[PDB]
From a paper:
TRHR is mainly expressed in the anterior pituitary where it modulates the synthesis and release of thyroid-stimulating hormone and prolactin via mediating the actions of thyrotropin-releasing hormone (pGlu-His-Pro-NH2 (TRH)). Upon activation, TRHR primarily couples Gq/11 proteins to exert its regulatory roles. Here, we report the high-resolution cryo-electron microscopy (cryo-EM) structure of the TRH-bound TRHR–Gq signaling complex.
To improve the expression and stabilize the TRHR–Gq complex, we combined several strategies to assemble the complex, including an engineered construct of human TRHR with a BRIL fused to the N-terminus and the C-terminus truncated at Y348, the widely used dominant-negative Gαq chimera (GαsqiN, hereafter referred to as Gαq for brevity) and NanoBiT tethering strategy. The structure of TRHR–Gq complex was determined to a nominal global resolution of 2.7 Å by single-particle cryo-EM, allowing accurate modeling of TRH, receptor residues E13 to N336 with the exception of intracellular loop 3 (ICL3) and most residues of Gq. Detailed interaction analysis revealed that TRH forms extensive hydrogen-bonding or polar interactions with TRHR, involving the residues in TM3/5/6/7 and ECL2 (T1023.29, Y1063.33, Y181ECL2, R1855.32, Y1925.39, Y2826.51, N2896.58, R3067.39, Y3107.43, superscripts refer to Ballesteros–Weinstein numbering). Most strikingly, mutations of a succession of tyrosine residues (Y1063.33, Y181ECL2, Y1925.39, Y2826.51) abolished the downstream signals, highlighting their important roles in TRH binding and receptor activation. Our high-quality cryo-EM map is clear enough to model the carboxamide group in an “up” configuration, providing a more precise template for further drug discovery. Structural analysis indicated that substitution of S1133.40 with the typical I3.40 would cause steric hindrance with the adjacent residues R2836.52 or F1995.46 of TRHR, which might impair the receptor activation. The TRHR–Gq interface involves TM2/3/5/6/7, ICL1/2 and helix 8 of the receptor and α5-helix, β1, αN-helix and Gβ of Gq, with a total interface area of 1483 Å2.
Numbering used by the authors:
A (entry chain S): 2 to 120, 124 to 235
B (entry chain G): 7 to 62
C (entry chain R): 13 to 220, 257 to 336
D (entry chain B): 3 to 340
E (entry chain A): 5 to 52, 231 to 409
Write the structure that this text describes.
Amino acid sequence: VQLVESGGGLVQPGGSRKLSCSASGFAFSSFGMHWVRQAPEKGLEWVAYISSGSGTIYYADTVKGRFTISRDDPKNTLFLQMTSLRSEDTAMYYCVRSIYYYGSSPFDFWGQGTTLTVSSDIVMTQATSSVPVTPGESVSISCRSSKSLLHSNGNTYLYWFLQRPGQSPQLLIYRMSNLASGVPDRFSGSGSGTAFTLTISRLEAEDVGVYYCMQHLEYPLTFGAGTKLEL
Amino acid sequence: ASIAQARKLVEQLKMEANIDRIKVSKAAADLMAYCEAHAKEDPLLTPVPASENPFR
Amino acid sequence: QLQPRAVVALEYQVVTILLVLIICGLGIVGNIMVVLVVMRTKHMRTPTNCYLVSLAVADLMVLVAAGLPNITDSIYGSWVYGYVGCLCITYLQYLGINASSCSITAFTIERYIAICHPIKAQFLCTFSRAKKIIIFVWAFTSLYCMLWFFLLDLNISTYKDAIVISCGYKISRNYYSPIYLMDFGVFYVVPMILATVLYGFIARILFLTVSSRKQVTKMLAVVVILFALLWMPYRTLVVVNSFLSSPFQENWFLLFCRICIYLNSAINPVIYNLMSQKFRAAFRKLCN
Amino acid sequence: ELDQLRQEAEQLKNQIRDARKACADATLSQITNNIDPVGRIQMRTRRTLRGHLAKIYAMHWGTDSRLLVSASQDGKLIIWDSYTTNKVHAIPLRSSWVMTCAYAPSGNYVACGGLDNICSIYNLKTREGNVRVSRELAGHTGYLSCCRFLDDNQIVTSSGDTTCALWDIETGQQTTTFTGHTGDVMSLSLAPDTRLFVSGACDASAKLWDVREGMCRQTFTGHESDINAICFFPNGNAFATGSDDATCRLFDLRADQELMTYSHDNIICGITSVSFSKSGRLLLAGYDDFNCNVWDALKADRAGVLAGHDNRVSCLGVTDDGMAVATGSWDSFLKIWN
Amino acid sequence: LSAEDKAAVERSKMIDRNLREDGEKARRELKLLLLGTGESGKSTFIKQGIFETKFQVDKVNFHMFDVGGQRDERRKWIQCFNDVTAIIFVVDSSDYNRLQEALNDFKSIWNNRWLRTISVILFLNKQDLLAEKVLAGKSKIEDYFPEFARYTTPEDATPEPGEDPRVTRAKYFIRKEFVDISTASGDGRHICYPHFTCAVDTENARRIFNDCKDIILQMNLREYNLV
């Protein structure tokens, strides 16, 4: 499974530029797709979403009316049309895969990303920012939500992402308790409604990245500030 | 030759004859005890309220 | 006119009441019978049953909404119901007598397609297609009968000794030639001509187990003749009256035409369900 | 030569019959006559599953009591979310003549088969996002009857010949062959400990096999026609068989005897599927008269009737927690009862 | 209620659309089932586990199935071949030793409880070898059937213009056996269509098409309340 994105560069304010992401190694038509914005020295932000059959399209409030998302099924590529660019859009843009059936892990694969340079919601709070760590120890990362994420159907909607330095974000835990495929059994998650915690046992050198806390109860999707573990 | 089939049938009957069988009453008592021990936690036999019914 | 009204000599009374009670009761029980048989039995999802329940509902409408006011109008002489009574009861009268004809038309067309083009009918005639045809029939007839809503009235022909109220027409009778001519045209001559032509095609297909070919042709013939003959008096009277100087009431011809209506409605279940084997097997499995 | 063997076989059969007669000290009905009856069971249809366009021939519940797999003659498997009636997956099949379907206890794979003589195993959890055939099991010489998973790697299949097989999915080979039947094997049922299993065939007999040794242990007779369904008791010491003679029979492993016979004078149609409740108190049987009946297992009295299927009820299923019963029939509809 | 639930039900609706499209595509074909023994030649009678055969006559798609490798004694997989358009039974003629077995097989299929409403198209393959057998003598059908001593050919039906009278009597007796078995029961729900064919005939597809039209016509004569 490979996602290759292209179309970035330096754009003067008020211009227009189109981003494209090429997909291979999986059934593109059966998966929904997102666009996620990283910011230069800030956390992740959600941009847009298109469904598998393009029936439903969602946009962030900061890009509504100026950004357009489209999907090409015969030619497995995804397009993001940007109009009326401001200096606040200078960031790195990621394409994220999603399928959304019962028992699935939506935000499973992320793209490499493209660097673009110009010139009622749920607040997800990660109070701690930097935690010094030593290999072989156990640490916990907390998360708080303005609204309870426990649904009447018994599912809570919490997603844990790990972003190693110089790499794309990687899914760790979905629905607070289900471990993602390829994730070692060191990681574990627990919580109830509003308070959440990600538990890591037997810390290794590969866990030096920044951990993010995401909700999926309602649109728009919101991320946490980010907690960094430093050796 | 049918001699091999006859020998196989005879051997199978011989190994099926030497089975330690118990009386019918003991098995009936065991089945009744199992049914009575699990009379609860049987939604079909004992219906559950609508709050405990995922198919409401 | 003359003050003392022409009174029933209590032969007209009894004869009218008994014939209406008999025809309407038998037709009502037959139509309820076919609806119950097709709904209670498991395997009546065929398009034929869609057409025949449409026809049964239309015939029940005709009976309960047209024949039973005849009992009251006979015993009492006037239309003892009200303005909303005339509007609603008469909407139901016309809606039934037109929806019966449309159901007959569509069933004749599908009989033709199924007998003369069997493989195309197997690939084509489904239950969903039948449902679509039926709902289109009912909607396009309800629109016409709303047009009937906007034109009825209670006419008062009063003698100096006693009064008579029978609900009639808002405007003059001679302006009803469009409604009645279009009614005659579509709902009488298109099913009659279609039935003759298409059932003749069916017969020429069948003639070329011959015992299965024997009774079906006479059944088709009796269906066509019954439709044409029993529907001619009412429609022709209604069209002729819209072009006369002073129309023809005479109180014994109108009985004739309305009895022909109710006989058609009561006879339809017999000739369309009871004469078949599917319905008889369903009644046997249902009712021992 | 052959006369001595025939005489010895007849003597052995007489000895085993005498052993059964000597072990029949009492009747189950006489013992259970003092037990209070279960009363009237009134189950209402709660979910109706639509989407199949042909005759449904097999179903199987998952271990989580939510996911459900169904097979139909249109050539597609559908995985259902029974709580929300959603279709999780729709798996095309190379052969449209499918007669069986199985759901793995781990929930990772499904299996199907039929007139193509091949047991096809499908992988449901793949990185590509689609359902793909893992391997096609071949080696049977007859139409593939019911199949059941032991774990993620072993499966037990029954064929239109007189043999059953144990397969290794990792290597795609037949590890053990179970011979002894003289007719077409129709149904399978696995013991809760997965150490034994029973097979019903068209010789009006049922046999008990052990998996690790491949040797037949017990043989059960009493039916007058073809056995179509078989199902273990929850405790694993008894099983019930449905046949075409309008009769359900309860058999015993420890006593090796017929224990109870379930029949009615008003039932003249064969039996398609047989299932138990969680406690074993209720026996549910699908019938050819478009209905499903609930039988008191101990008292052999009818408890209730399930009606609402317009064609032959072809399969039955009860969830592991025993909350609901799912019935599939030839009218391309599956209904969940509770 | 939840966003994931809405996405799941949208996926279910897409699956529903795909299923409806596939079912509509597969609906427009007629399915036929082919039976007969090894002697029959059923493999080569239409020139154009499970064997698959497709042919088209007058823009109508036919889908014929042959079940091979199984046992012909007991056939319990017939229940999955219910609601087919027709069943094609090919009989090896000129083989007097297994004519009784073929008649027994036809009787078993005709009286099956799952084929009460399914008609049978009967083919008597390679009538040529029958012609040389009845013209060359030394092979008496009288020995295998004692009824072939008082039987006379019907005066109504007519043979081929060049056909010998001796061939026609044997052909009519062999056809009469199957017709008698067909008419012994069935209550008129399903009928049989005899046909004489050889290995070099190219009109069998048209025969099947005409018989299928007759079958569907008789089915709609009862489905639609006419008979």
